[PDB]
Amino acid sequence: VQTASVIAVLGAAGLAVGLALQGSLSNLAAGVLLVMFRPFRAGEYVDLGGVAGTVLSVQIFSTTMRTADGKIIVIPNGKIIAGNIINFSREPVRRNEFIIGVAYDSDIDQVKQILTNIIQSEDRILKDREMTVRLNELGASSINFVVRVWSNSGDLQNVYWDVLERIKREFDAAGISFPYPQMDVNFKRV
Amino acid sequence: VQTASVIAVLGAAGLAVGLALQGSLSNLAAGVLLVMFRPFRAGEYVDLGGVAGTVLSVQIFSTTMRTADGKIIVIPNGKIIAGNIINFSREPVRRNEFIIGVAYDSDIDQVKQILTNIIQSEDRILKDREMTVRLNELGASSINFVVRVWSNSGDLQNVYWDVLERIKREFDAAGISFPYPQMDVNFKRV
Amino acid sequence: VQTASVIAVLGAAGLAVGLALQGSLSNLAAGVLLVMFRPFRAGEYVDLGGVAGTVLSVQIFSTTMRTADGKIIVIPNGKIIAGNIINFSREPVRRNEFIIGVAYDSDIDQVKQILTNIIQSEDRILKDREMTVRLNELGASSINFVVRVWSNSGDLQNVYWDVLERIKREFDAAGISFPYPQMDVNFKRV
Amino acid sequence: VQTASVIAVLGAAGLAVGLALQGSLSNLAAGVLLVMFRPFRAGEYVDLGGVAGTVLSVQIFSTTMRTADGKIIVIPNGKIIAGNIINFSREPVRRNEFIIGVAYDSDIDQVKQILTNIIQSEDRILKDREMTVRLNELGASSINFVVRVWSNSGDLQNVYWDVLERIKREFDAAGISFPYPQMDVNFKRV
Amino acid sequence: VQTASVIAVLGAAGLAVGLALQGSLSNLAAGVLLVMFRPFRAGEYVDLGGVAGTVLSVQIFSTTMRTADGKIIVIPNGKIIAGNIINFSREPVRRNEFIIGVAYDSDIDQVKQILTNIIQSEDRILKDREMTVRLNELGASSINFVVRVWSNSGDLQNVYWDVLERIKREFDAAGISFPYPQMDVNFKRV
Amino acid sequence: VQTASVIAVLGAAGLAVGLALQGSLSNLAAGVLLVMFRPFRAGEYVDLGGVAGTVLSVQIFSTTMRTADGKIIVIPNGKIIAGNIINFSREPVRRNEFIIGVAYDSDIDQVKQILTNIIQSEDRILKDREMTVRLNELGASSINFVVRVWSNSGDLQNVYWDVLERIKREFDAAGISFPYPQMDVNFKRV
Amino acid sequence: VQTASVIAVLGAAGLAVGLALQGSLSNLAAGVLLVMFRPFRAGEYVDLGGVAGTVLSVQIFSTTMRTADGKIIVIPNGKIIAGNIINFSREPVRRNEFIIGVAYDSDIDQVKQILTNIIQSEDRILKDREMTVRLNELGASSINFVVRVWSNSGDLQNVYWDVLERIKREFDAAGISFPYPQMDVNFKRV
């Protein structure tokens, strides 16, 4: 009959209902934020929360995306806002990174010259950007050269594959050897 | 006799009861949201939060699923909406990935040609989609080729197994060798 | 003498008491939810939160389980619902997974035939379900075959052990060899 | 002079004081909960929150335990109730696990027979419980047998040590060899 | 018709809406905080949340950064405030670290002298700062020296590459050898 | 002019200020709790939060401690009461652990006898407590024996060092050999 | 027109704004707390939350530090108090730790005598503090000795480097050898 216990228990029930809606309400707020700022739109290859693919559509509660191999992934908007966004289509030009390990005894300037010839021969490589072919690091078993090449995002993978194959062919022709993991022993007969 | 301490303690009890219901209320809210949006329904092979299988049924509090090995798992809906969900039946066609390591001295174009012949021989491979047979990377002990092949989700595993067996047979016939991890030594008698 | 500071401090004390009860109230709510939905009952092998065993009984505050080796573990219900739950007795039939590594030179179809003969010989194997014996993958030092066998949950371990022993004996008899990790070396005296 | 700002600021101070007491109040609530259900008492070997030892006494704020090496550890009761806690004194009988690696060429049934003789020789081994001596797994360099033996909790360690020593002596006497990590090499003179 | 249930339910709805806005409001507060303290501004190379790049622009809700390879990353301001932020352009001069591993029998003072000559030869090295060339550590297979060189941020990478190439050339000329992973063996042929 | 918006906004500001003080108030509450239970007092060797050393003094907000190497660490009391604390000085006697790896062919009982003689010779070892010298584990390359020795906390490290040196000397004198990592090869000329 | 819905929605907006300011207000409270206790001050080398350097200045919202190599780091104060803080400059004298691995056959007391002579010869070593030169442990491939040396914080690194170089030179002169990773083989011709 008291008017205080009833209002207290209804307030407790209301806060419980709010805490229940918590997940869905947070996700829908995240989704409406995403749509009204549109950092990324449907149909462009991107990466969200560590998983990459083309987003088919974005919904109020979550988003639907398809990776390269055909996985259909539904990601709740809360994680998109919590996580990072890695957009690919925003920049038409990107950069490929080749790491080539060669033997210690192999000539240095010869490798740089042949790599420069290879990259200059390729036409899909953006010549305006830097053509980086430098001795990167002195590895445990082989010295590693680094190659940074800028090219359009559309033909990035094809450029990578063609450059790698040409590198293999030219290295085989020129006698430069890709070394297996080296190691040396010391015999001690007992 | 005071009417303020009693209402205060009843309010504290009510908020405590709400915080008690927290887990069950959140889980049931997530479950009803999933039911009323239905990213996936019962009877399709999917993966939730890292565990995969066929969902037998979905309940208000959690969901029941069977792993490929007959394992029965109940997953709370709160973690489902908090986690990532991926579906297999949504996309009828998926893509298999083969990674084949071959010795450095092995011929390059011959391997590509024989792999293309193998994939063309198979009929369950979708001809409309791409057939990527390219050099992928120069590994420490062997050069790795990548093969990306699209096929229907129903027969994906069978296509994978048959392609792998045919690859093994053809490589053995053609003399191409799968190399063991190479090592280099340098004798130093003391 | 003020009637506002006193009600404020009593309200603060009440919310503090609620936040104190937080753990016990959440755990008891979780336990009552479990008992009134009974996803699992007492006396059947299960796995909660990564630790597995047979539950002796379930209480309002936590649950009591006995591990295979005899560990007595009491698990709070809150983390039981927070984490996943695995059940064994729900599905009377499960699937065993054998992975067998063999040398590259070993015959392929002979191994498949002998494995099929072995699994056919065993009677506890459920013949209605699939009996997969396929080349699974090309390992670094040995090709690994996969065997999937469906059998009743009661005799799963015994079937596994008997199949493994028979595999060992038949492989020894037939000349098939389990290869040790294979390396290859290149001598170059200095 | 306003009566609303003062009550508002005192309420804010009260909730701040409650959030201050948060840790101590939660810990004492957990402690009293553990006291009045007493899943474990003082003086028996247990493992709480990943650290094992004999609990000396339990307090309202935390618990005091002594590790086997003499470390004195004080654990807050909140972490006690949060994580999994296990007891060893609850079950008078536990199970020891032996993993014995032997060479591929070693006789199978001979090892099983000698292990059965060893376990039958020991009297502290519970005869009623199972005596599992089966080929467990085919390891990379050796085949591993599993031995599961039930015995009283008090003499578990002594049984383990005596069984291990007898296993070593019997294996040395019978000619069974514990293999070192086996390696295979292939010479390539260049 | 009651005036208490309606206000209670509207208060619950309002707190639910606030908990929905939670993420957006926190992120916008973080962004405005960043704007009005400007720890970093657009167009300078920075590294936040573990990802590095040039800040193309800063928005109220998030920040847009271009990675060195051309990647576009959108980072919510909540991560910037919560995580650590690192700046490059704030300090015009930085320090390059070189770790060089040599043979155990190689001369010590000769290496230090040649390294000092190398660093003195370079002009972009800031001579006012220290030029640390000391025996750092006695590694498992080689002794490692550390070189610390201070130079302007603009030419840091070029200085690093040129110094490394000159180190390689001078070491080859002087006969100092970079040792492969050493490991000796003992023969106990049965 | 409204008297409701003003009280609402002042209440919001008050709860914001409470959330501001949250960390400092929690830390000071934890500190005063630790002071008034004093689980550890100033000037004793302890370990908390993964860092060990002697606490110089404890403050209301945090604590000041010095590591064995002279490091000065200030640790917030909140994380102290959140984590686990262990005290070296509480127990005057602790237990030292020795793990000794010996060859497979080495005599078993001889090693146990010589270790028992060594520990008997030492006087700082508490003879009342157990002195365990038993075979412990069958390693991949060497069998590991276990030694548990109880001694006063003051001379624990000195006892450890002296016992280790005596073990080394006695093993060298008696012909027992500490084996290098063993490994087996199988030549296969091609 | 109702006076209850308006106050409810304004209260919800106020709590939303409070939760928005939450991060910045918590950080500023942490910063002012640090200032008014000044556990560390500008210009002294310290380590906060895992990143080390000299703090240039401390602000209300965060702090600015420059690492050894010149990176500019902005650390929020909330993370500062959340994590540990260690001060190098508070204690004028610290302790360097050398670990020296030597062969099993090398003399024990000779190495200790050499190390004692080396540390005694050095003058920057604090003679009042202990000079620990003891056999630390029996490594897998080499026995490791530990050397603990106390010296002023200013010349700690120089003392370390000079001691290491002198150790190398003296060990080379005395014939003591730093062993490469040992390993043993067993020939098994097939």
Per-residue 3-state assignment (H helix, E strand, C coil) for A61-79: CEEEEECCCCCEEEEEHHH
Q: Is E53 left (phi over 0), alpha (psi -120 to 50) or beta?
A: left
3-state percent helix, strand, coil for chain F, nearest multiple of 5 = 40, 30, 30
Q: Are G46 and G40 in contact (CB under 8 A)?
A: yes
Which residue in this structure is represented by tokens 């229907």?
Answer: B152
Tell me which residue of D180, D186, D172 sits closest to D104, measured CA to CA. D180
**CA torsion through residues A117, A120, A122, A126, sign:** positive
Choose the closest CB to G70 out of E18, E91, E134: E91
Please answer whether residues B97 and B134 qualify as being in contact, where contact means their C-beta atoms are separated by less than 8 angstroms: no
CA distance B139 to C189: 26
Whether B182 contacts A181, CB under 8 Å: yes
Q: How far is CA B181 from CA A154, B103, C184, in A?
A: 36, 10, 7
Chain G nearest-CA distance from E109, in A, is 10
H and E: helices and strands count for chain B: 4, 8
Spatial contact of E161 and A135, defined as CB atoms under 8 Å apart: yes
Option in F26, F82, F186 nearest D19 (CB): F26
Buried b (16+ CB within 10 A) or exposed e, B133-158: bbbbebeebbbebebbbbbeeeebee
Per the CB < 8 Å rule, is D143 touching C168? yes
CB-CB neighbors (< 8 A) of C100 in chain D = 138
| Distance of alpha carbon G83 from alpha carbon G34, whole angstroms | 13
Please give the C-alpha separations between residue A71 and each of B46, B87, B92, B97, in angstroms, as whole numbers. Answer: 10, 7, 10, 13
Order across the sheet with A132-138: list the strands: A93-102, A143-152, A132-138
Cα angle for residues E60, E65, E66 (degrees, 5° grid): 155
Residues of F with Cβ-Cβ distance to G39 under 8 angstroms: 62, 74
Query: Can you name the residues that pair with E93 across neighbouring β-strands?
Result: E152
- Number of Cβ atoms within 10 Å of the Cβ of A65: 24
Q: Nearest residue on chain F to D177, judged by CA atoms?
A: F104
Q: Which chains touch A (3 or more CB pairs under 8 A)?
A: B, E
E75 to chain A: closest CA residue: A84
- In angstroms, the Cα distances linking E108 to C160, D56, E96, G171 are 61, 58, 22, 13
Q: What is the DSSP letter of B125?
A: B
The full DSSP string for chain D is: --HHHHHHHHHHHHHHHHHHHHHHHHHHHHHHHHHHH-SS-TTSEEEETTEEEEEEEE-SSEEEEE-TTS-EEEEEHHHHHHS-EEESSSSSEEEEEEEEEE-TTS-HHHHHHHHHHHHHH-SSB-SSS-EEEEEEEE-SSSEEEEEEEEEESTTHHHHHHHHHHHHHHHHHHHT------B-B----B-
Counting one residue from chain B and one from chain C, the pairs whose CB atoms sit within 8 A come to 139
How many Cβ atoms are within 10 Å of F20's Cβ, its own excluded?
22
In angstroms, the separation between the Cα of residue A129 and the nearest Cα of chain B is: 25
CB F182 within 8 A of CB G184: yes
Report CA E48 to chain centroid distance, whole Å.
Answer: 10
Mutate to test the interface with C, among D80, D86, D136 (most CBs of C within 10 A): D86
Round to whole Å and give the CA distance between B45 and B42: 9
Contact between F53 and F66 under an 8 Å Cβ cutoff? The reply is: yes
Contacts of A75 in chain B (CB under 8 A): 84
The whole-angstrom separation of Cα A94 and Cα A154 is 9
Largest CA distance in chain E: 99
- Domain containing C79 equals 3-87
Q: Which residues contact A148 (CB under 8 A, 6 or more apart)?
A: A95, A96, A97, A130, A132, E69
One-letter amino acid of B88:
F
| Residues constituting chain F | 190
CB contact under 8 A, E186 and G184: yes
Please tell me which of the candidates D6, D95, D108 has its beta carbon nearest to residue C70: D95
Burial of residue D92 (number of CB atoms within 10 Å: 0-12, 13-18, 19+): exposed
Question: How distant, in Å, are the alpha carbons of E189, F108, F180, F181 from that of F105?
Answer: 16, 9, 14, 14
Chain A positions in Cβ-Cβ contact with residue E53 (cut-off 8 Å): none
What's the CA dihedral at C159, C165, C167, C168 to 10 degrees? 160
State how far the Cα of G24 lies from the Cα of E33, in Å rounded to an integer.
7
G50: left (phi over 0), alpha (psi -120 to 50) or beta: left
- Establish whether chain A is in contact with chain E, requiring a minimum of 3 CB pairs below 8 angstroms: yes
* CATH code for the domain of G65: 3.30.70.100
Name, in order, each residue with C-beta under 8 angstroms of A129's C-beta and a sequence gap of 6 or more. A93, A95, A150
What 3-state class would DSSP assign to B12? Answer: helix
3-state SS, A163-190, equals HHHHHHHHHHHHCCCCCCCCCECCCCEC
The verdict on a CB contact (< 8 Å) between C25 and B8 is no
**Rounded distance, CA F90 to CA D65, Å?**
11
Q: Which residues pair with E52 in a beta bridge?
A: E47
Q: For the packed helices E5-37 and G5-37, what is the interaxial angle rounded to 10 degrees? A: 40
Name the residue among C15, C29, C141 with its Cβ closest to that of B23. Answer: C29
CB contact under 8 A, E23 and A108: no
Q: Which of A15, A22, A62 sits opposite B15 (nearest CB)?
A: A15
Q: Which chains touch D (3 or more CB pairs under 8 A)?
A: C, F
Signed CA dihedral, D21, D23, D29, D35: sign only = negative
Answer whether A190's CB lies under 8 Å from E186's CB: yes
Q: Please, which residues have CB within 8 angstroms of residue D170's CB and are 6 or more apart in sequence?
A: D114, D118
Single-letter amino acid, residue G14 = G
Q: Contact, C163 vs C122, CB < 8 A?
A: yes
Q: Are the C-beta atoms of residues E188 and A187 closer than 8 Å to each other? A: no
Q: How many CA atoms lie within 13 A of A49 on its CB side?
A: 19
Asked whether the beta carbons of C184 and B179 are under 8 A apart, the reply is: yes
Name beta bridge partners: G102: G143
On whether the CB atoms of residues D139 and D101 are closer than 8 A, the answer is yes
In this structure, are residues A75 and A40 in contact, taking their beta carbons and an 8 Å threshold?
Answer: no
Q: What are phi and psi of D61, to 5 degrees?
A: -90, -35
Q: Do G70 and E10 touch (CB under 8 A)?
A: no
Which among A19, A61, A71 has the least Cβ separation from residue B26?
A19
For strand D72-76 and strand E62-66, is the pairing parallel, antiparallel, or unpaired?
unpaired
Which two structure tokens, joined as six digits, stand for F101?
A: 């790896």
Among A22, A71, A161, the residue with its CB nearest the CB of B86 is A71
Q: Do chains G and B touch (3 or more CB pairs under 8 A)?
A: no
Whether F187 sits inside 8 A of G183 (CB atoms) is no
Look at residues B161, B47, B176 and name the one whose alpha carbon lies nearest to residue B103: B176
Pairing of strands G184-185, E186-187: parallel
Interchain CB distance below 8 Å, C30 and B24: yes
**C52 neighbors C84 (Cβ within 8 angstroms):** no
Give the separation between CA D143 and CA F186, rounded to whole angstroms: 18
Q: Which residues of G touch E81 (CB under 8 A)?
A: 23-24, 27, 76
Q: From CA E24, how far away is CA A33, in angstroms rounded?
A: 7
Tell me if D85 and C74 make a contact (CB, 8 A cut-off).
yes
b/e per residue, D157-188, with b = 16+ CB within 10 A? eebbebbbebbbebbeeeebebbbebbbbbeb
Please name the method used to determine this structure.
cryo-EM
Nearest of G104, D180, D100 to residue F181 by alpha carbon: D180
Mutate: best of C35, C41, C90, partner B, most B CBs <10 A: C90
- Which residues from C are below 8 Å from B69, CB to CB? 94-97, 148
Q: Does the distance separating the beta carbons of D23 and F33 come in below 8 Å?
A: yes
Distance CA A54, CA A37 (A): 19
Alpha helices, DSSP H, located in B66-122? 77-82, 108-121
Chains F+D touching (3+ CB pairs under 8 Å):
yes
G34 within 8 A of G79, measured Cβ to Cβ = no
How many helices (H) and strands (E) would you count in chain C?
Answer: 4, 8
Burial D120-130, CB ≥16 within 10 A → b, else e: eeeeebeeeee
> CA A23 to CA G53: how far, in whole Å?
41
Q: Determine, for residues D85 and C100 on separate chains, whether the beta-carbon distance falls below 8 Å.
A: no
Residues paired with D109 in a beta bridge:
none
Taking the C-alpha atoms of residue C114 and residue C117, their distance in angstroms, rounded to an integer, is 5
Residue B78, helix vs strand vs coil: helix
CB nearest A75 (choices: B84, B189, B190): B84
CA distance D31 to D79: 10
Q: Which among F84, F138, F182 has the least Cβ separation from residue D168?
A: F138
**Sheet of strand F131-138, all strands in order from the earlier edge strand to the far edge:** F93-102, F143-152, F131-138
Q: Are D39 and D85 in contact (CB under 8 A)?
A: yes
What is the rounded CA–CA span in Å between residue C106 and residue C177? 8
Q: Is E36 helix (H, G, I), strand (E, B) or coil?
A: helix
Within C38-122, residue ranges assigned H as helices are 77-82, 108-121
CA dihedral D82, D83, D87, D91 (to 10 degrees): 100
Is residue E26 within a helix (H) or strand (E), and if so which, with residue range? helix E5-37
Structure tokens at G15: 């709590």
The answer to whether the Cβ–Cβ distance between B8 and C3 falls below 8 Å is: no
Q: Where do runs of H (alpha helix) occur along B106-186?
A: 108-121, 156-174
Integer Rg of chain C from CA: 28
What is the rounded distance in angstroms from the CA atom of residue G94 to the CA atom of residue G124?
12
- Touch of D by E (3+ CB pairs closer than 8 Å): no
For residues E161 and A136, give the distance between their C-alpha atoms in angstroms, rounded to a whole number.
7
CB C142 within 8 A of CB C102: yes
Q: Report which of A48, G74, G78, A40 is spatially closest to residue E46, judged by C-alpha positions.
A: G74
In this complex, whether D and A touch, counting 3 or more CB pairs under 8 angstroms, is no
Q: Which of B180, B186, B188 sits opposite C183 (nearest CB)?
A: B180
Are the beta carbons of C13 and D18 separated by less than 8 Å? yes
Q: Do chains F and G touch (3 or more CB pairs under 8 A)?
A: yes
Which residues of G fall within a CB distance of 8 Å from E37? Answer: 59, 61
Residue in D5, D9, D22, D26 to test binding to C, most C beta-carbons within 10 Å:
D26
The DSSP output letter for E98 is E
CA distance D96 to C178: 30
d(CA F98, CA B74): 46
What are residue A79's phi and psi, to 5 degrees? -75, -35
